[PDB]
Ligand SMILES: *C/C=C(C)/C=C/C=C(C)/C=C/C1=C(C)CCCC1(C)C
Ligand SMILES: CCCCCCCCCCCCCCCC
Ligand SMILES: CCCCCCCCCCCC
C-alpha cells in the first residue's frame with residue numbers, strides 16, 4: 001500500500017478512458033489520413049495505461065542505492081516514455097509534412113533522452129545521476145528546438161487550419177515536456193525534495209495532459225483529414 005497508488009490508479013483510469021474514447025472515434029472514421037492520426041494517437045494512452053496499471057499492481061519499481069539510502073525508482077515510466085514520446089513527435093511531424101531525415105533525427109534524440117534518463121535513474125553514484133540527467137535534458141532541448149524552429153517553419157507551408165492546430169499542439173508539448181526534467185531533478189530520482197507521492201501526482205498530470213489532452217486537441221481538429 002504505497003501512498004502514491006492513488007495517482008497510479010487515477011492515471012490508469014484516465015489513460016484507459018481516453019484510449020477507449022480515441023478507439024471508438026477512430027474506428028468510426030473512414031478518411032485514410034485521419035485514420036493514421038487515430039492509430040498513432042490511440043496507441044499512446046494505450047501504452048501509458050498498461051504501464052500505469054503495471055506500476056499500480058507493484059511492477060516497474062526497483063530500489064537504487066544512492067546518498068547512503070535505498071531509493072524507490074519507478075523504471076516502468078521509461079518503458080512507457082520510450083514508445084509514447086516518439087509516437088507524439090510523429091503526430092506533429094505528420095501534421096507538418098516534416099522531412100524523413102528530420103523525423104529520424106527527432107526519434108533518435110528522443111531515444112537518447114529516455115535511454116540516458118533511465119541510466120540516470122538507476123545510477124548508484126549520486127553525482128553521476130546528474131550527469132545523465134543533463135545529457136537527457138540536452139537531447140530533450142534539441143527536440144524542442146526542432147519542434148519549435150523546424151516544425152513551425154514547415155507548418156507555415158500548410159493551410160492555416162493545419163498550422164494553427166500544429167501550433168497549439170507544439171505549445172502544449174513545449175510547456176509539458178519542459179517540466180519533466182525539473183520534476184526528476186527535485187523528486188525521487190534526483191534531489192529527493194519532492195516525495196514520491198507528490199512526484200507521482202506531478203507525472204500523472206503531465207502524462208495525461210501530454211497524451212489525452214494532446215489527443216483531444218489533435219483528434220477533434222479538421223487538421224487530420226485528407
Ligand atoms: C507521455 C509521456 C511524456 C510526454 C513524457 C515526456 C518525458 C520527457 C520529456 C522526459 C524527460 C526527461 C529529461 C529531459 C531528463 C531527465 C529524466 C527524463 C526522462 C524525465
Ligand atoms: C542556427 C542556430 C543555432 C542555434 C542554436 C541553439 C541553441 C540552443 C538551445 C536551446 C534550446 C531550446 C529550445 C527551445 C524551445 C522553445
Ligand atoms: C486497446 C487498443 C488499441 C489500439 C490501437 C491501435 C492502433 C494500431 C492499429 C492500427 C493498425 C492498422
Ligand SMILES: CCCCCCCCCCCC
Pocket residue numbers: 104105106108109112135138139142
Ligand atoms: C541520428 C541520431 C540523432 C541525433 C542527431 C543530433 C543530435 C543530438 C543529440 C544529442 C545529445 C546530447
Ligand SMILES: CCCCCCCCCC
Pocket residue numbers: 131135
Ligand atoms: C566526472 C564528470 C563526468 C562528465 C562527463 C560528461 C560528458 C558527456 C558529454 C555528452
Ligand SMILES: CCCCCCCCC
Pocket residue numbers: 128131135
Ligand atoms: C551517448 C552519451 C554517452 C556519454 C557517456 C557519459 C559518461 C558518464 C560518466
Ligand SMILES: CCCCCCCCC
Pocket residue numbers: 134
Ligand atoms: C561540477 C558542477 C557541474 C557543472 C554543471 C553544468 C551542467 C550543464 C548541463
Ligand SMILES: CCCCCCCCC
Pocket residue numbers: 193
Ligand atoms: C515551494 C516548494 C518548497 C518545498 C521545500 C520545503 C521542503 C522542506 C524540506
